[PDB]
């Protein structure tokens, strides 16, 4: 499969950007998380970024730290996450599905075996948050052997060597960090910026998705206007879950309203 | 691309988010530069001598070994300013921070000794220090938290995850990933991403250098073995480094056995954990079957850490160093024995190293052996822990 | 009849019951013999170096004095094994006990530091130690009482009189008056009957000898003044002794002012008491109008003693040393200032000496002066005392 | 006056030893202490040794430590003690009265003035417990200027030089310590012994009184048989006070019975 390539071609045909929510799998429990994810898709999500709960999410701010904790309170394991993934794919055959992983969960029972399991359930990409390009070889090689896109990160201050490496090594999409620091809606980033977006295109990188701090429709619109192929939003989505824990039907209605507005901002 | 090898065989590396790579590369370059700079070396030596009190003594313990063929010396890091060896490397890292033009320090701490060491170095050298500490540790380490605050450091409780050391480690890295342009992360052991295992070894290696000169002076020969407790690995690698190329000298690292290895309540990942990737490194760690980072356990808060520095994993793999474990009860008996027979109150951490030397002696009392135990710290902080158990006995 | 002068001008003497005179004469003879014996000197120097960690550092404190013409050094007795200067003289007295063939030690203690020092020396050197401590002090010094017991000493509460230090002093002498044939009384300060003020000075005088060599090395000249707190007088006379004949060097002793001299709640008998005869000596003391021995007072338990060594009274009388006082609040501010600006936690006792140096600097900030403060101990023991007051503020 | 010389001459005429109790002045209060002292005399005490309460009685064991504490609980001061002494002398003109002092109470307001006050109230001797012969000069000189006997102590292991000094410097009686240690009935001493008693006589010392640990009639008899002129008992007397605090009439009856038995033992 190449679900991202098909998505980006379709969006390009429509002069449209991608809107890609992040959530933690199994937050606040397996059944509600499956409903959340179906809601995000029905509301207009072009692709998904999905976190496997991890004990030590060191690239995440408090909102997503708390999502991981809620999933653990519900007993969510990586094996349950793969069951969820298989079901999500069985429901939705074309949406690109990306995982947000930390290295130990990939390395734990063997790197090759991890990416083989991703291929089996129909995942499209894996972003390992704590593996920089410098350490990425065995991860990217295993990803490509199993038809999984390895996602790499372009920081705002990326030099030319790093841009070249991210462009060569990544597939699916290039992650364009909006700022330094950790995930969170409370901290708005840049200013993609344009120079980086242009150099990535020059180097034939996978299309750029901007992420970190994207919490409003205006930011989605700006990202696309700057030349990114779309935008990722996590904390802003997860905050709606957190706010409405006691009210699961209201949670779904608010997610739908938010995602619909965010996706609307990506259209030409 | 790096200047130095980030790995010790398969162990080590730089497993941090991409955003932190330039901070690690900058730190490595500044370290390499500082190591060739005689002015930096002279400043560091001056602080170690005139502020921290180096060289520390090497004490022959005759009462402990009476009636056996063991000769035992203790390297007296308990006499260093601050009461533990941690002071050596925080002084060097504070000088690196200043070399790089940074004015702020971030540190993690569990038991609080590293937080206190970081706070004292920062007070001396004009740095603004903030310390992350798991909220459970904050609750149980009031004396150390108060010391940090008296020295002008900000202590920030960490409530995420298990609210203990590993969660404080994460939070320090989260802060650094947004603040590296102005702050240096003063990591507290010989672990984490390169270049920290290397830097911390080199800023602790005077322990072993002095021990070698002192034992040559007193005995005319090298030790048969040097023995050190292993939390993250700093005091042990500081003792071991200068002996690595002296192939006759045994290197013995002692992990905490807690309630016993078989109970699973221990802190001995090097010999009883599983290799993983966390806190910036590939190393043995305490983890669940699924790969969640697990909590360790020891009577000594300072040894209670779920991984180990990568150079120890490497030295073990090639057979250059041997690693063993000592239980809570063994460490407690060594603590009591040193108090009563030598008039020295050892840290419970260090008591693990001493307990293994006592076992070496007692098991084979007619074996001729010249041993050095690294007495990493003093045990004033532990008297109530020891009281509360001996009270329940 | 004695070998040495028991008086310092009018002060001092041997005011003990007749039964104890032979014990004092025996001790004086053994001391005089030991002082001429190069083997005793070598053994004492070896313990001081390799067990206690001498020489202690001399630390230049630049942050404290910024913007003034004061240069301040701290003599780091806080780095000595045990965390205070007391360790020096207990090692020497334990060696004298063994020289005389004694196998038992009696000691008095108030705050507990001398008891701990005595217990550690006795553990090291194979002596059976018993320690008298006023029952009120036992109650308030659990950490020190536990240290003494861990080191194998018997701690005997004293319930007579005021159940504090002076009553423990009496009880130690009562025991000795029946046990001197087998026990040595390890007196804890430079006070009491001859020969103790002399012996304790001579076994502390390395403080000043080292300071002189260190300051000559660093500054090329002697200090303008050396400053030390005065409980009974040991750390101060240890700092002062080697400077007495350097007439340009000021000697400043700092008594505790407590809540203020005018309140009567203080421990400053040298400047604000009245000469009396007690604890074997003629010296200034805290006493009622009728001549009952009164209780003193300081925030620092270690300075809370109702007399002073006779050599200090003498040096004051001839003008060779000047004595001042520092209140609880002044000492607390110095404690906080050293923590925050130098990363050193000083004993509250030593904080009195530091507070007076800070006043010397602040009152006359354009006066060129090279000062040494004797940092007699570390202040880990005081963090909760300091906490509990800063909490109430 | 020389009340001791007259006493010893009278006792010698009768081949009799002296029995000399010690009590603390003002224990357990001034009025009861005056009654105690009258009882001791009526029961046969030949002389008295009387302590002035002191904060730090470092030659005394627990029994007498507790006597000092009781007197302080009653507010007893040295000035009140001198009032008591003057009254005791006004009642009893010939009994020798010795004080047991600690140095600071003598030195406090001037050594000469202290011994002048002793002369004024009719005290015969002063024993300063913490002033050895080596430090005694200003005390013995002031005592003699005011017709007060300075009492010195002969320990059991006294060498010849010390015997000579005690013999030369003392007056009234020579204190013969029965043993090392501190006062107390719980610790019986020696074995005066005879050699010391004989050397003291050779050196024309004041007559010897044995003290420390004398608690039974047999010890009084033995002391006199050994050549001492008599015996002092303190703790054994003070224990009767302590035992009967709640019963002041019983206290007096028991003191009388004890002193009568002790004095009987000194007779030929
Ligand atoms: O909207 P926000 O600020 O919560 O950001 C959500 C991002 N979620 S994610 O899965 O794309 C994502 C991507 C990269 C991350 O770390 C790394 F850059 F180090 F790799 C972490 C999370
Ligand atoms: O019967 P005991 O054992 O209580 O002894 C009672 C003695 N009372 S006393 O006043 O003669 C007396 C005599 C001498 C003392 O000390 C000194 F020897 F050091 F001077 C103390 C008390
Ligand atoms: C912190 C500490 C240790 C353990 O840490 P390492 O990095 O393994 O040295 C051991 N001893 C003492 C006294 C400590 O304070
Ligand atoms: C005991 C003590 C003192 C006071 O005693 P001195 O005999 O006057 O020195 C001062 N400082 C410290 C740290 C002490 O422990
Ligand atoms: Cl909204
Ligand atoms: Cl490798
Ligand atoms: Cl043995
Ligand atoms: Cl400290
Ligand atoms: Cl060997
Ligand atoms: Cl070997
Ligand atoms: Cl391994
Ligand atoms: Cl004189
Ligand atoms: Cl200033
Ligand atoms: Cl100690
Ligand atoms: Cl000056
Ligand atoms: Cl001067
Ligand atoms: Cl004076
Ligand atoms: Cl009876
Ligand atoms: Cs738009
Ligand atoms: Cs031995
Ligand atoms: Cs460990
Ligand atoms: Cs200055
Ligand atoms: Cs004092
Ligand atoms: Cs008789």
């Amino acid at each position: 499969m190449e679900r991202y390539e098909n998505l980006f071609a379709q969006l390009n045909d429509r002069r449209e950007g991608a809107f890609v929510p992040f959530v933690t799998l199994g937050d606040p429990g397996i059944e509600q998380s499956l409903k959340i994810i179906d809601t995000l898709i029905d509301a207009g999500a072009d692709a998904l970024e999905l976190g496997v709960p991890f004990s030590d999410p060191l690239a995440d701010g408090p909102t997503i730290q708390n999502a991981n904790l809620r999933a653990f309170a519900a007993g969510v394991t990586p094996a349950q996450c793969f069951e969820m993934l298989a079901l999500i794919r069985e429901k939705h055959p074309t949406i690109p599905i990306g995982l947000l992983m930390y290295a130990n969960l990939v390395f734990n029972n063997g790197i090759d075996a991890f990416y083989a399991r991703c291929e089996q359930v129909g995942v499209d990409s894996v972003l390992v948050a704590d593996v920089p390009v410098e350490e990425s070889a065995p991860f990217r090689q295993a990803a490509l052997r199993h038809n999984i896109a390895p996602i790499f990160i372009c920081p705002p201050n990326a030099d030319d060597d790093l841009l070249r490496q991210v462009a060569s090594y990544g597939r699916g999409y290039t992650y364009l960090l909006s700022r330094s620091g950790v995930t969170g809606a409370e901290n708005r980033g840049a200013l993609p910026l344009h120079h980086l977006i242009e150099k990535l295109k020059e180097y034939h990188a996978a299309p750029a998705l901007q992420g970190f701090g994207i919490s409003s429709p205006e930011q989605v619109s700006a990202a696309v206007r700057a030349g990114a192929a779309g935008a990722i939003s996590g904390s802003a989505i997860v905050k709606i879950i957190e706010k409405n824990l006691a009210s699961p039907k209201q949670m779904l209605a608010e997610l739908r309203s938010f995602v619909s507005a965010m996706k609307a901002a990506s259209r030409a | 691309t790096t200047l130095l090898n980030p790995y010790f065989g398969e162990f080590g590396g730089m497993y941090v988010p991409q955003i932190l790579m330039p901070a690690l590369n900058q730190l490595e370059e500044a370290f390499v530069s500082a190591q060739k700079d005689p002015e930096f070396q002279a400043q560091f030596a001056d602080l170690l001598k005139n502020y921290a009190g180096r060289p520390t003594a090497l004490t022959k313990c005759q009462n402990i070994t009476a009636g056996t063929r063991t000769t035992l010396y203790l390297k007296r890091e308990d006499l260093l300013h601050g009461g533990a060896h941690k002071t050596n490397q925080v002084l060097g890292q504070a000088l690196l921070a200043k070399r790089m033009g940074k004015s702020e320090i971030i540190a993690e701490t569990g038991a609080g000794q590293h937080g206190v060491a970081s706070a004292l170095a920062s007070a001396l050298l004009g740095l603004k220090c903030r310390i992350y500490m798991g909220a459970k540790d904050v609750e149980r380490q009031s004396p150390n938290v108060f010391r940090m605050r008296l020295m002008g450091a900000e202590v920030i409780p960490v409530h995420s995850g298990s609210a203990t050391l590993k969660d404080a480690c994460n939070e320090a890295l989260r802060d650094w990933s947004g603040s590296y342009e102005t702050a240096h992360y003063m990591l507290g052991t010989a672990a984490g991403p390169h270049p920290y295992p290397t830097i911390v070894r080199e800023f602790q290696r005077m322990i072993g250098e002095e021990t070698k000169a002192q034992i040559l002076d007193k005995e005319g020969r090298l030790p048969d073995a040097v023995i050190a407790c292993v939390g993250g690995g700093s005091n042990a690698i500081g003792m071991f480094a200068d002996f690595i190329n002296d192939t006759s000298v045994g290197l013995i690292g002692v992990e905490p056995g807690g309630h016993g290895i078989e109970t699973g309540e221990h802190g001995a990942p090097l010999k009883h954990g599983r290799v993983g990737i966390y806190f910036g490194m590939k190393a043995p760690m305490m983890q669940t079957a699924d790969g969640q980072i697990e909590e360790s356990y020891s009577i000594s808060a300072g040894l209670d850490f779920p991984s180990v520095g990568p150079q120890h994993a490497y030295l073990n793999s090639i057979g250059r160093a041997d690693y063993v474990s000592i239980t809570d009860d063994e460490a407690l008996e060594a603590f009591k024995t040193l108090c009563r027979h030598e008039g020295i109150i050892p840290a419970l951490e260090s008591s693990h190293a001493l307990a293994h030397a006592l076992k070496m002696m007692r098991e084979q009392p007619e074996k001729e052996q010249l041993l050095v135990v690294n007495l990493s710290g003093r045990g004033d902080k532990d008297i109530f822990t020891v009281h509360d158990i001996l009270k329940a006995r």
Side-chain angles (χ1 to χ4, degrees), chain A, chain B:
Chain A
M1 319 310 279
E2 270 303 335
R3 295 190 182 84
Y4 287 102
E5 293 67 25
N6 295 342
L7 175 67
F8 289 127
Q10 289 147 17
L11 291 172
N12 189 62
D13 183 64
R14 308 198 300 256
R15 312 260 264 178
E16 186 163 313
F19 176 61
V20 179
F22 168 95
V23 294
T24 298
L25 290 163
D27 173 22
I30 295 173
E31 286 317 304
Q32 182 71 1
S33 180
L34 288 165
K35 291 183 188 163
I36 286 164
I37 288 162
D38 286 345
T39 297
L40 304 180
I41 294 167
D42 192 67
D46 293 299
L48 300 170
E49 200 61 37
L50 300 175
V52 173
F54 183 54
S55 58
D56 296 271
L58 56 74
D60 285 296
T63 297
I64 295 170
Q65 289 164 29
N66 292 336
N68 283 275
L69 286 170
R70 292 191 294 272
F72 281 125
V76 176
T77 62
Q80 290 169 357
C81 288
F82 278 106
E83 294 163 19
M84 292 177 69
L85 291 164
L87 178 54
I88 297 160
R89 176 58 71 212
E90 280 186 286
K91 287 183 291 193
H92 305 286
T94 62
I95 188 167
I97 295 173
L99 301 187
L100 181 290
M101 297 307 303
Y102 286 87
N104 199 52
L105 291 184
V106 176
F107 179 82
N108 185 50
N109 295 355
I111 295 177
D112 195 75
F114 181 86
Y115 287 98
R117 182 77 178 122
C118 287
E119 184 183 25
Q120 181 179 53
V121 303
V123 157
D124 302 295
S125 71
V126 171
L127 192 171
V128 189
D130 57 345
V131 174
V133 289
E134 293 86 345
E135 292 290 0
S136 67
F139 296 89
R140 68 185 199 259
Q141 292 154 2
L144 293 172
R145 286 190 305 268
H146 295 97
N147 305 302
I148 303 303
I151 305 304
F152 296 106
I153 310 300
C154 185
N157 285 58
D159 71 11
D160 194 60
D161 286 327
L162 180 54
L163 286 163
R164 282 177 194 267
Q165 283 180 281
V166 170
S168 181
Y169 291 158
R171 298 286 198 288
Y173 71 90
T174 301
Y175 201 105
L176 182 72
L177 274 178
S178 71
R179 51 159 175 81
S180 67
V182 296
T183 64
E186 66 271 26
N187 185 2
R188 303 199 151 199
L191 177 108
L193 32 44
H194 310 72
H195 188 272
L196 297 177
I197 288 164
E198 291 170 31
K199 295 304 289 192
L200 287 166
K201 287 176 185 181
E202 183 186 337
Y203 303 144
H204 303 109
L209 298 179
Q210 191 187 341
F212 281 38
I214 304 291
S215 66
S216 65
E218 191 155 38
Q219 291 173 283
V220 174
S221 185
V224 171
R225 180 164 62 255
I232 292 162
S233 176
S235 299
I237 302 272
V238 176
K239 280 202 279 162
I240 298 169
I241 298 171
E242 185 180 343
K243 163 193 184 288
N244 294 288
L245 292 169
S247 302
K249 279 169 267 289
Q250 175 160 349
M251 185 190 295
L252 297 182
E254 292 193 1
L255 284 166
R256 176 180 294 279
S257 181
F258 185 69
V259 169
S260 302
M262 295 292 271
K263 173 62 200 171
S266 74
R267 297 194 177 99
Chain B
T1 301
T2 60
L3 298 175
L4 305 177
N5 190 349
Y7 282 90
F8 298 91
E10 76 206 79
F11 306 105
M14 297 169 83
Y15 290 96
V16 295
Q18 193 68 59
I19 195 72
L20 275 175
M21 289 298 299
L24 295 176
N25 283 137
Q26 172 194 43
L27 175 63
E28 187 199 48
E29 195 279 339
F31 173 72
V32 169
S33 179
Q35 291 288 269
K36 302 176 195 165
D37 182 349
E39 292 177 358
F40 181 96
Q41 301 306 134
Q43 185 169 11
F44 185 28
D46 192 293
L47 290 174
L48 290 167
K49 179 182 188 193
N50 297 308
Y51 175 79
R54 299 209 78 80
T56 58
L58 184 76
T59 305
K60 189 179 180 193
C61 291
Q62 295 174 203
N63 298 327
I64 284 224
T65 62
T68 78
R69 300 194 81 193
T70 293
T71 299
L72 176 61
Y73 287 82
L74 308 184
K75 178 56 172 169
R76 302 296 300 287
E77 297 302 297
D78 63 298
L79 299 176
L80 196 66
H81 178 55
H85 68 290
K86 295 187 167 62
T87 297
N88 299 312
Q89 76 97 7
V90 295
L91 290 168
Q93 283 202 59
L95 292 179
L96 287 181
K98 292 157 69 67
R99 182 183 191 86
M100 294 183 289
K102 301 210 188 171
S103 68
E104 299 178 13
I105 295 293
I106 303 163
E108 86 290 343
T109 197
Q113 187 62 32
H114 183 63
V116 170
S118 294
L120 72 83
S122 294
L124 179 64
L125 294 168
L127 298 161
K128 187 186 183 197
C129 184
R130 64 190 178 264
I131 301 164
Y132 289 101
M133 190 173 192
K136 284 172 192 272
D137 291 323
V138 172
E139 281 167 27
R140 63 195 168 181
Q141 305 290 354
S142 308
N144 281 340
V145 168
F146 189 55
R147 292 177 170 95
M148 289 176 245
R149 292 179 166 150
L150 279 167
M151 294 187 288
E154 176 178 24
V155 173
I156 302 167
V158 176
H159 301 279
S160 51
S162 67
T164 61
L165 179 56
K166 68 175 182 65
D167 313 291
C169 287
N170 303 333
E171 195 73 14
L173 291 170
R174 294 183 181 109
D175 182 335
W176 203 37
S177 73
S179 68
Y180 55 85
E181 299 275 31
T182 58
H184 176 57
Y185 175 32
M186 186 179 280
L187 208 160
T189 191
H194 178 79
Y196 290 99
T198 296
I199 292 174
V200 174
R201 176 192 72 227
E202 294 299 300
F203 291 171
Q204 288 291 359
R205 73 176 299 122
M206 64 290 300
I207 297 173
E209 291 172 345
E210 293 172 10
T211 296
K212 176 181 286 182
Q214 291 166 315
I215 200 85
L216 284 172
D217 182 54
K218 287 150 163 254
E219 296 287 336
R221 54 157 304 204
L222 299 174
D224 296 307
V226 300
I227 305 132
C229 70
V230 179
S234 68
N235 88 87
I237 205 73
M239 174 63 81
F240 291 175
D242 205 57
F243 299 105
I244 288 172
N245 291 341
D246 298 304
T247 58
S248 70
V249 178
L251 307 177
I252 304 171
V254 185
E255 299 190 281
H259 297 313
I261 300 304
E262 69 288 344
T263 71
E265 295 301 309
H266 62 78
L270 197 154
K271 292 305 286 300
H272 305 285
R274 198 149 56 73
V275 177
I277 297 169
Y278 166 66
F279 192 45
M281 58 174 188
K282 181 180 290 181
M285 56 194 57
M286 312 286 294
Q287 53 172 318
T288 67
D290 284 357
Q292 311 295 352
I293 310 307
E294 261 212 349
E295 255 181 288
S296 41
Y297 169 74
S298 177
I299 193 180
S300 178
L303 292 188
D304 197 349
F305 175 63
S307 188
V308 64
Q311 188 169 10
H312 291 291
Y314 174 66
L315 289 170
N316 182 51
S317 73
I318 65 173
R320 176 66 188 100
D322 295 318
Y323 297 83
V324 297
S325 66
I326 282 290
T327 65
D328 287 359
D329 283 350
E330 290 173 317
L332 286 161
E333 182 267 316
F335 177 103
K336 290 189 293 166
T337 292
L338 194 69
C339 286
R340 168 76 177 162
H341 293 284
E342 303 293 344
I344 302 166
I345 304 176
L348 281 172
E349 293 82 354
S350 318
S351 294
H352 288 74
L354 179 59
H356 186 69
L358 293 175
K359 178 183 291 185
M360 293 166 67
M361 172 185 77
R362 292 163 179 165
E363 287 188 353
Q364 307 184 305
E366 280 73 61
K367 182 182 180 175
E368 196 173 1
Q369 59 191 330
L370 175 58
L371 307 181
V372 180
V373 162
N374 198 27
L375 207 72
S376 55
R378 47 181 182 76
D380 303 69
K381 69 195 171 63
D382 299 305
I383 60 186
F384 284 123
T385 296
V386 182
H387 183 80
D388 286 22
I389 296 153
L390 290 172
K391 185 163 59 208
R393 286 178 184 188

